[PDB]
Design a protein around this nucleic acid. Structure first.
Ligand SMILES: NC(=[NH2+])NCCC[C@H](N)C(=O)O
Ligand SMILES: [Mg+2]
Ligand SMILES: [Mg+2]
Ligand SMILES: [Mg+2]
Ligand SMILES: [Mg+2]
Ligand SMILES: [Mg+2]
Ligand SMILES: [Mg+2]
Ligand SMILES: [Mg+2]
Ligand SMILES: [Mg+2]
Ligand SMILES: [Mg+2]
Ligand SMILES: [Mg+2]
Ligand SMILES: [Mg+2]
Ligand SMILES: [Mg+2]
Ligand SMILES: [Mg+2]
Ligand SMILES: [Mg+2]
Ligand SMILES: [Mg+2]
Ligand SMILES: [Mg+2]
Ligand SMILES: [Mg+2]
Ligand SMILES: [Mg+2]
Ligand SMILES: [Mg+2]
Ligand SMILES: [Mg+2]
Ligand SMILES: [Mg+2]
Ligand SMILES: [Mg+2]
Ligand SMILES: [Mg+2]
Ligand SMILES: [Mg+2]
Ligand SMILES: [Mg+2]
Ligand SMILES: [Mg+2]
Ligand SMILES: [Mg+2]
Ligand SMILES: [Mg+2]
Ligand SMILES: [Mg+2]
Ligand SMILES: [Mg+2]
Ligand SMILES: [Mg+2]
Ligand SMILES: [Mg+2]
Ligand SMILES: [Mg+2]
Ligand SMILES: [Mg+2]
Ligand SMILES: [Mg+2]
Ligand SMILES: [Mg+2]
Ligand SMILES: [Mg+2]
Ligand SMILES: [Mg+2]
Ligand SMILES: [Mg+2]
Ligand SMILES: [Mg+2]
Ligand SMILES: [Mg+2]
Ligand SMILES: [Mg+2]
Ligand SMILES: [Mg+2]
Ligand SMILES: [Mg+2]
Ligand SMILES: [Mg+2]
Ligand SMILES: [Mg+2]
Ligand SMILES: [Mg+2]
Ligand SMILES: [Mg+2]
Ligand SMILES: [Mg+2]
Ligand SMILES: [Mg+2]
Ligand SMILES: [Mg+2]
Ligand SMILES: [Mg+2]
Ligand SMILES: [Mg+2]
Ligand SMILES: [Mg+2]
Ligand SMILES: [Mg+2]
Ligand SMILES: [Mg+2]
Ligand SMILES: [Mg+2]
Ligand SMILES: [Mg+2]
Ligand SMILES: [Mg+2]
Ligand SMILES: [Mg+2]
Ligand SMILES: [Mg+2]
Ligand SMILES: [Mg+2]
Ligand SMILES: [Mg+2]
Ligand SMILES: [Mg+2]
Ligand SMILES: [Mg+2]
Ligand SMILES: [Mg+2]
Ligand SMILES: [Mg+2]
Ligand SMILES: [Mg+2]
Ligand SMILES: [Mg+2]
Ligand SMILES: [Mg+2]
Ligand SMILES: [Mg+2]
Ligand SMILES: [Mg+2]
Ligand SMILES: [Mg+2]
Ligand SMILES: [Mg+2]
Ligand SMILES: [Mg+2]
Ligand SMILES: [Mg+2]
Ligand SMILES: [Mg+2]
Ligand SMILES: [Mg+2]
Ligand SMILES: [Mg+2]
Ligand SMILES: [Mg+2]
Ligand SMILES: [Mg+2]
Ligand SMILES: [Mg+2]
Ligand SMILES: [Mg+2]
Ligand SMILES: [Mg+2]
Ligand SMILES: [Mg+2]
Ligand SMILES: [Mg+2]
Ligand SMILES: [Mg+2]
Ligand SMILES: [Mg+2]
Ligand SMILES: [Mg+2]
Ligand SMILES: [Mg+2]
Ligand SMILES: [Mg+2]
Ligand SMILES: [Mg+2]
Ligand SMILES: [Mg+2]
Ligand SMILES: [Mg+2]
Ligand SMILES: [Mg+2]
Ligand SMILES: [Mg+2]
Ligand SMILES: [Mg+2]
Ligand SMILES: [Mg+2]
Ligand SMILES: [Mg+2]
Ligand SMILES: [Mg+2]
Ligand SMILES: [Mg+2]
Ligand SMILES: [Mg+2]
Ligand SMILES: [Mg+2]
Ligand SMILES: [Mg+2]
Ligand SMILES: [Mg+2]
Ligand SMILES: [Mg+2]
Ligand SMILES: [Mg+2]
Ligand SMILES: [Mg+2]
Ligand SMILES: [Mg+2]
Ligand SMILES: [Mg+2]
Ligand SMILES: [Mg+2]
Ligand SMILES: [Mg+2]
Ligand SMILES: [Mg+2]
Ligand SMILES: [Mg+2]
Ligand SMILES: [Mg+2]
Ligand SMILES: [Mg+2]
Ligand SMILES: [Mg+2]
Ligand SMILES: [Mg+2]
Ligand SMILES: [Mg+2]
Ligand SMILES: [Mg+2]
Ligand SMILES: [Mg+2]
Ligand SMILES: [Mg+2]
Ligand SMILES: [Mg+2]
Ligand SMILES: [Mg+2]
Ligand SMILES: [Mg+2]
Ligand SMILES: [Mg+2]
Ligand SMILES: [Mg+2]
Ligand SMILES: [Mg+2]
Ligand SMILES: [Mg+2]
Ligand SMILES: [Mg+2]
Ligand SMILES: [Mg+2]
Ligand SMILES: [Mg+2]
Ligand SMILES: [Mg+2]
Ligand SMILES: [Mg+2]
Ligand SMILES: [Mg+2]
Ligand SMILES: [Mg+2]
Ligand SMILES: [Mg+2]
Ligand SMILES: [Mg+2]
Ligand SMILES: [Mg+2]
Ligand SMILES: [Mg+2]
Ligand SMILES: [Mg+2]
Ligand SMILES: [Mg+2]
Ligand SMILES: [Mg+2]
Ligand SMILES: [Mg+2]
Ligand SMILES: [Mg+2]
Ligand SMILES: [Mg+2]
Ligand SMILES: [Mg+2]
Ligand SMILES: [Mg+2]
Ligand SMILES: [Mg+2]
Ligand SMILES: [Mg+2]
Ligand SMILES: [Mg+2]
Ligand SMILES: [Mg+2]
Ligand SMILES: [Mg+2]
Ligand SMILES: [Mg+2]
Ligand SMILES: [Mg+2]
Ligand SMILES: [Mg+2]
Ligand SMILES: [Mg+2]
Ligand SMILES: [Mg+2]
Ligand SMILES: [Mg+2]
Ligand SMILES: [Mg+2]
Ligand SMILES: [Mg+2]
Ligand SMILES: [Mg+2]
Ligand SMILES: [Mg+2]
Ligand SMILES: [Mg+2]
Ligand SMILES: [Mg+2]
Ligand SMILES: [Mg+2]
Ligand SMILES: [Mg+2]
Ligand SMILES: [Mg+2]
Ligand SMILES: [Mg+2]
Ligand SMILES: [Mg+2]
Ligand SMILES: [Mg+2]
Ligand SMILES: [Mg+2]
Ligand SMILES: [Mg+2]
Ligand SMILES: [Mg+2]
Ligand SMILES: [Mg+2]
Ligand SMILES: [Mg+2]
Ligand SMILES: [Mg+2]
Ligand SMILES: [Mg+2]
Ligand SMILES: [Mg+2]
Ligand SMILES: [Mg+2]
Ligand SMILES: [Mg+2]
Ligand SMILES: [Mg+2]
Ligand SMILES: [Mg+2]
Ligand SMILES: [Mg+2]
Ligand SMILES: [Mg+2]
Ligand SMILES: [Mg+2]
Ligand SMILES: [Mg+2]
Ligand SMILES: [Mg+2]
Ligand SMILES: [Mg+2]
Ligand SMILES: [Mg+2]
Ligand SMILES: [Mg+2]
Ligand SMILES: [Mg+2]
Ligand SMILES: [Zn+2]
Lengths: 112, 140, 154, 116, 101, 59
RNA sequence: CGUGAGGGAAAGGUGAAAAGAACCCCGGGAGGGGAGUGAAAUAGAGCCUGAAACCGUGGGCUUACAAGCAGUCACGGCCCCGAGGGGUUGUGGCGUGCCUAUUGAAGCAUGAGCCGGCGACUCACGGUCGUGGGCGAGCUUAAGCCGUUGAGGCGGAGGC
RNA sequence: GUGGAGCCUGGGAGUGAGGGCGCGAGCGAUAACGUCCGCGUCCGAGCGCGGGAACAACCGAGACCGCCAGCUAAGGCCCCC
RNA sequence: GGAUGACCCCAGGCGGUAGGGGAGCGUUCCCGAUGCCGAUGAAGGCCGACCCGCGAGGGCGGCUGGAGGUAAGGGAAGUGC
């Protein structure tokens, strides 16, 4: 049995959030919570949100035990980018891409 | 039918006395042994030749005026970094390298060729420390 | 590219922009540009020789005659406009609808009765044509339509 | 009527990209680089199946040469002896004999020394 | 016992029970054919000069086939020259029945 | 200067090889001897406000 | 966009029916997990199909003494599907991208970031050969007219 | 002398920047990877194959496809090979 | 050879740029079609180490997809990047 949650269209660049997701892949739920709590990255706030939503899904929807939960899989996908005009010198306009992220956490149960 | 491909074989250790032998004419034979081309099952893409031990490498011999006129050369990569060393001085300072250099130049370039060179063990003086391998003496 | 809605303005200078040279945006190299050698309204008709047409007519009828698929009739007993009436007549005439039939007759009431049958094509004699003959597996003509046919291949 | 590209070019591109599976980077991902890589690949295969025939003959000759020198003659004199003896066993089988059947190869060497 | 036979312009070491692909022969499947012998070996050694007078190998033809397709591809740079050929080499498959030495 | 510019697009391989030094190191955490909560060493505990065995701030 | 004359886009599709997801759960929300609807929900509205470049996660093989237009030929190792084949590639052999332009280019000469889609030898009338048929000292109609409503016929003025 | 020989009529072209080499000359300086003709040749179009360390035109030789068969060419046979 | 493209046997040719000629493949549309294939699943997509074809291609099978497609034989072009 697995439990998952997805935060779709989070306004943060995938490369940035992935660094944080890599921190908790394969960790126990409790170890991931401690890591996310003291990770000095904006992405810690968003990953934590998805992590807890998956845990809640595990306990409340899928009959899993909070004390058995671990991050079985986690990945960030890229959503539609918001394209913005960045004015430069000599009348030139650049395009900034404010990228966006689909954050998936999947929890399983570590038996014993 | 496909051509016979040998399974891994135990290599043969051999011992050669270099005293009095002609530098380059001895080296061609050693490279043959290193390639294992004396063997009926020679295969070019595996290291399957002999391990070769050489003693009295400092007593190697040479014709003409090569002792004074043969120049080994090393390039350090810096301005003015071309070092020229004559045979004479090399024999007086690192004699085993004279034969080692001759044989290396006669081995193929590449990863296998460098591996084959490691199977060559060259010693100045009559002794070598490979008694445990019990090398078979060759007259070449 | 002349008939397309855009201005004939040169979209940017010839040289020194770093882009490929272009003229107006109606050129066929642009998305939304004019089309090169596209179709234009066109008359596909042509005057095939009259003697070829008339000879084709005769051959097409000959082909059915040689197969035994040409049948002439004096009259359509009691078919007066109703499809059911022609169906009865057809059955007695051996036209059970297993073969497509080209029905040539100047009798309007016969044409109106047969024409809705999927397996019948109906023509007045002055409209006998070889495509319609070859389309169908059988030829069925009035003696009157037959004489019009004979007058035309003469 | 109009005949737009439709499916035709996608399908041609996939045939080429499929033939290029295994190639490095864009050489298996880009239709253009895959096609360029396949041009070279086809010439190489042609050139190398010609070349394979020589590669193996070279290997046979080298093995035959070492087998001969265990019996005190070299390859060239061995081959000449076989020609005078009228023996036509080819180099592929001679090299097999030299490895798999040393008593037969020793005999063949005998015939060759004796044919001169 | 083994024999070196010659068929299809090529030479093969054969033993009874060996299945072998050779160049296509004009022989009905199921038939048996006799292959000429250049050399016998194993128990006794017979050397042909070039072919052994009495000897022969009996083989049953199992069938004919076409080898896996080989792509023959030609390309010349800067000259718009490209050629694609599919080649399948015919073959006969032989079961070696006996060495009649 | 004269506007140096990349000569070739960087390959996926070379881009990702440059990034072989980018993985974060996890935050170092020790247990608080008072409330057992995980927290960075040498900081006042944010869960109970203790440090060096005594209460330092309201939590 | 341009002072203005003027220029001038992009952007279609849930499902048969909104039955457009009550209610509960994590979340400030967004989003999601259940429940429920539906023949189908990677048909859930950022909605038919959903290619490719491009970006991830998981797995197999492989790689830190190695010289490379990246392949190809050979052999061996490992993995997979069951005298065979698929994947991978250690070593050995060989090996100067594509296109264009040129006497001559891997060329340090041109063009191309990559992918998808648009993108260039046509049509009318006349001509000249060739060719498939019709007729033959003849051959042929044009505009029209009648018919048909995807029916053909008439029409000899005229042209060769 | 039966050859992808030749001749006649007609349809379709492309080419009208050549280049190296050998021989014969002119120009040049008994210079040029020079230049301009002549006879021949190869590359062009054979940047396909062997040899020449590598290399369009030097030597060998005109690649329909396949073979883990055999003979040779130039060039080679101490080791790289 | 046999009479004719029925297939066989023998022999020979088959490097190629500009370019000439020949034979084919596929795309859109029309006749064939008031037909026929189709929810027991059209077109399109994704696989395949299978079959046919020199090749361009064509089959067949598994998955996706969910409503169209269209034969032998011919016709016409906005026809292949
Ligand atoms: N008699 C006639 N002119 N009939 C013409 C046929 C008209 C129409 N196409 C039909 O099938 O009914
Ligand atoms: Mg941190
Ligand atoms: Mg909880
Ligand atoms: Mg700025
Ligand atoms: Mg401005
Ligand atoms: Mg400004
Ligand atoms: Mg500007
Ligand atoms: Mg940007
Ligand atoms: Mg020796
Ligand atoms: Mg000497
Ligand atoms: Mg020393
Ligand atoms: Mg060397
Ligand atoms: Mg080498
Ligand atoms: Mg225009
Ligand atoms: Mg205009
Ligand atoms: Mg306009
Ligand atoms: Mg306008
Ligand atoms: Mg306008
Ligand atoms: Mg204008
Ligand atoms: Mg204009
Ligand atoms: Mg204008
Ligand atoms: Mg203007
Ligand atoms: Mg310009
Ligand atoms: Mg630019
Ligand atoms: Mg441009
Ligand atoms: Mg540009
Ligand atoms: Mg311009
Ligand atoms: Mg333009
Ligand atoms: Mg315009
Ligand atoms: Mg438009
Ligand atoms: Mg537009
Ligand atoms: Mg338009
Ligand atoms: Mg156009
Ligand atoms: Mg035009
Ligand atoms: Mg135009
Ligand atoms: Mg009109
Ligand atoms: Mg016309
Ligand atoms: Mg007209
Ligand atoms: Mg109708
Ligand atoms: Mg009808
Ligand atoms: Mg009909
Ligand atoms: Mg009708
Ligand atoms: Mg197109
Ligand atoms: Mg299209
Ligand atoms: Mg396409
Ligand atoms: Mg294409
Ligand atoms: Mg496709
Ligand atoms: Mg295709
Ligand atoms: Mg690979
Ligand atoms: Mg790749
Ligand atoms: Mg890559
Ligand atoms: Mg890709
Ligand atoms: Mg190819
Ligand atoms: Mg080949
Ligand atoms: Mg080759
Ligand atoms: Mg000897
Ligand atoms: Mg000989
Ligand atoms: Mg011989
Ligand atoms: Mg034979
Ligand atoms: Mg056996
Ligand atoms: Mg065969
Ligand atoms: Mg090129
Ligand atoms: Mg070329
Ligand atoms: Mg090239
Ligand atoms: Mg080209
Ligand atoms: Mg060229
Ligand atoms: Mg080309
Ligand atoms: Mg075979
Ligand atoms: Mg400066
Ligand atoms: Mg400067
Ligand atoms: Mg600078
Ligand atoms: Mg400055
Ligand atoms: Mg700058
Ligand atoms: Mg640059
Ligand atoms: Mg990239
Ligand atoms: Mg990667
Ligand atoms: Mg890098
Ligand atoms: Mg509290
Ligand atoms: Mg203005
Ligand atoms: Mg305005
Ligand atoms: Mg304007
Ligand atoms: Mg629009
Ligand atoms: Mg809908
Ligand atoms: Mg709707
Ligand atoms: Mg429905
Ligand atoms: Mg809340
Ligand atoms: Mg809450
Ligand atoms: Mg909600
Ligand atoms: Mg959730
Ligand atoms: Mg929900
Ligand atoms: Mg349901
Ligand atoms: Mg169903
Ligand atoms: Mg789906
Ligand atoms: Mg759907
Ligand atoms: Mg629909
Ligand atoms: Mg969709
Ligand atoms: Mg999608
Ligand atoms: Mg995709
Ligand atoms: Mg991976
Ligand atoms: Mg080293
Ligand atoms: Mg290593
Ligand atoms: Mg290699
Ligand atoms: Mg090999
Ligand atoms: Mg395998
Ligand atoms: Mg492989
Ligand atoms: Mg392998
Ligand atoms: Mg070799
Ligand atoms: Mg290169
Ligand atoms: Mg070159
Ligand atoms: Mg190309
Ligand atoms: Mg170009
Ligand atoms: Mg140019
Ligand atoms: Mg130029
Ligand atoms: Mg030039
Ligand atoms: Mg280069
Ligand atoms: Mg370059
Ligand atoms: Mg330039
Ligand atoms: Mg370039
Ligand atoms: Mg230019
Ligand atoms: Mg650009
Ligand atoms: Mg790309
Ligand atoms: Mg494209
Ligand atoms: Mg034309
Ligand atoms: Mg036109
Ligand atoms: Mg025209
Ligand atoms: Mg015309
Ligand atoms: Mg004409
Ligand atoms: Mg004509
Ligand atoms: Mg006529
Ligand atoms: Mg007339
Ligand atoms: Mg006139
Ligand atoms: Mg000729
Ligand atoms: Mg000629
Ligand atoms: Mg003739
Ligand atoms: Mg002519
Ligand atoms: Mg022509
Ligand atoms: Mg023409
Ligand atoms: Mg010209
Ligand atoms: Mg001209
Ligand atoms: Mg001119
Ligand atoms: Mg000229
Ligand atoms: Mg010139
Ligand atoms: Mg000239
Ligand atoms: Mg000139
Ligand atoms: Mg000359
Ligand atoms: Mg000359
Ligand atoms: Mg001379
Ligand atoms: Mg002279
Ligand atoms: Mg001269
Ligand atoms: Mg002169
Ligand atoms: Mg002088
Ligand atoms: Mg010159
Ligand atoms: Mg000169
Ligand atoms: Mg001169
Ligand atoms: Mg010349
Ligand atoms: Mg040219
Ligand atoms: Mg040549
Ligand atoms: Mg030539
Ligand atoms: Mg050449
Ligand atoms: Mg070349
Ligand atoms: Mg070469
Ligand atoms: Mg050469
Ligand atoms: Mg060479
Ligand atoms: Mg060489
Ligand atoms: Mg060269
Ligand atoms: Mg040159
Ligand atoms: Mg030829
Ligand atoms: Mg020989
Ligand atoms: Mg010679
Ligand atoms: Mg040499
Ligand atoms: Mg050798
Ligand atoms: Mg033949
Ligand atoms: Mg032939
Ligand atoms: Mg040709
Ligand atoms: Mg022809
Ligand atoms: Mg076609
Ligand atoms: Mg197509
Ligand atoms: Mg239409
Ligand atoms: Mg219809
Ligand atoms: Mg229909
Ligand atoms: Mg049905
Ligand atoms: Mg159903
Ligand atoms: Mg299905
Ligand atoms: Mg279709
Ligand atoms: Mg369609
Ligand atoms: Mg297919
Ligand atoms: Mg379905
Ligand atoms: Mg399908
Ligand atoms: Mg429908
Ligand atoms: Mg159709
Ligand atoms: Mg028709
Ligand atoms: Mg049309
Ligand atoms: Mg077009
Ligand atoms: Zn505490």
């Amino acid at each position: 049995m697995e439990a998952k949650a997805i935060a779709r269209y989070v306004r943060i660049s995938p490369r940035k959030v992935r660094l944080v997701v890599d921190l908790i892949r394969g960790k126990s739920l409790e170890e991931a919570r401690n890591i996310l709590r003291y990770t000095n990255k904006r992405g810690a706030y968003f990953v934590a949100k998805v992590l807890e939503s998956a845990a809640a899904n595990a306990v409340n929807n899928h009959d899993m035990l909070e004390d058995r939960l671990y991050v079985k899989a986690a990945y960030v996908d890229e959503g539609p980018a918001l394209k913005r005009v960045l004015p430069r010198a000599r009348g030139r306009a650049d395009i900034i891409k404010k990228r966006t992220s689909h954050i998936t956490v999947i929890l399983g149960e570590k038996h014993g | 039918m496909k051509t016979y491909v040998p399974k891994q074989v135990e290599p043969r250790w051999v011992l050669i006395d270099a005293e009095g032998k002609t530098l380059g004419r001895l080296a061609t034979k050693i490279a043959t042994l290193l390639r294992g081309k004396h063997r009926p099952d020679w295969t070019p893409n595996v290291a399957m030749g002999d391990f070769v031990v050489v003693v009295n490498a400092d007593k190697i011999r040479v014709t003409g005026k090569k002792l004074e006129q043969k120049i080994y050369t090393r390039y350090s990569g810096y301005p003015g970094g071309l070092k020229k060393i004559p045979l004479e001085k090399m024999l007086a300072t690192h004699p085993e390298r004279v034969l080692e250099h001759a044989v290396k130049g006669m081995l193929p370039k590449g990863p296998l060729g460098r591996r084959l060179f490691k199977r060559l063990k060259v010693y100045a003086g009559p002794d070598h420390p490979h008694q445990a391998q019990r090398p078979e003496k060759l007259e070449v | 590219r002349g008939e397309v809605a855009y201005s004939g303005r040169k979209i940017w200078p010839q040289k020194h922009t770093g882009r490929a040279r272009h003229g107006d945006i109606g050129a066929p190299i642009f998305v939304g540009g004019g089309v090169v050698f596209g179709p234009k309204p066109r008359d596909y008709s042509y005057t095939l020789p009259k003697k070829v047409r008339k000879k084709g007519l005769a051959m097409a009828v000959a082909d059915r005659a040689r197969e035994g698929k040409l049948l002439l009739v004096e009259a359509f007993a009691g078919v007066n406009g109703k499809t059911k009436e022609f169906l009865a007549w057809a059955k007695e005439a051996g036209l059970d609808g297993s073969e497509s039939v080209l029905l040539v007759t100047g009798n309007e009431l016969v044409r109106r009765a047969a024409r809705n049958l999927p397996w019948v094509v109906t023509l007045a004699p002055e409209g006998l044509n070889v495509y319609d003959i070859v389309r169908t597996e059988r030829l069925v003509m009035d003696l009157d339509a037959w004489e019009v046919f004979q007058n035309r291949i003469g | 009527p109009r005949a737009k590209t439709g499916v035709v070019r996608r399908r041609k591109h996939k045939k080429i990209l499929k033939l290029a599976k295994g190639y490095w980077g864009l050489r298996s991902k880009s239709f253009r680089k895959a096609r360029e890589t396949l041009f070279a690949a086809g010439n190489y295969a042609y050139a190398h199946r010609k070349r394979r025939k020589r590669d193996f003959r070279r290997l046979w000759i080298v093995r035959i040469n070492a087998a001969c020198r265990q019996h005190g003659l070299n390859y060239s004199t061995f081959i000449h002896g076989l020609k005078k003896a009228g023996i036509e066993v080819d180099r592929k089988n001679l090299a097999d004999l030299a490895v798999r059947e040393p008593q037969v190869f020793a005999e063949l060497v005998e015939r060759a020394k004796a044919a001169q | 016992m083994f024999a070196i036979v010659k068929t299809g312009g090529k030479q093969y070491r054969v033993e009874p029970g060996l299945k072998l692909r050779v160049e296509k022969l004009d022989a009905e499947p199921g038939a048996t054919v006799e292959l000429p012998v250049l050399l016998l070996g194993g128990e006794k050694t017979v050397v042909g000069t070039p072919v052994v007078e009495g000897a022969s190998v009996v083989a049953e033809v199992l069938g004919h086939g076409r080898g896996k397709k080989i792509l023959v591809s030609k390309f010349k740079a800067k000259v718009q020259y490209r050629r694609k050929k599919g080649h399948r080499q015919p073959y006969t498959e032989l079961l070696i029945k006996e060495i009649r030495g | 200067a004269k506007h140096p510019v990349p000569k070739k697009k960087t390959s996926k391989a070379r881009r990702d090889a440059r990034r072989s030094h980018h993985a974060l190191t996890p935050p170092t955490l020790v247990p608080c001897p008072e409330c057992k909560a995980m927290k960075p060493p040498h900081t006042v505990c944010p869960e109970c406000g203790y440090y060096a065995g005594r209460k330092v701030l309201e939590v």
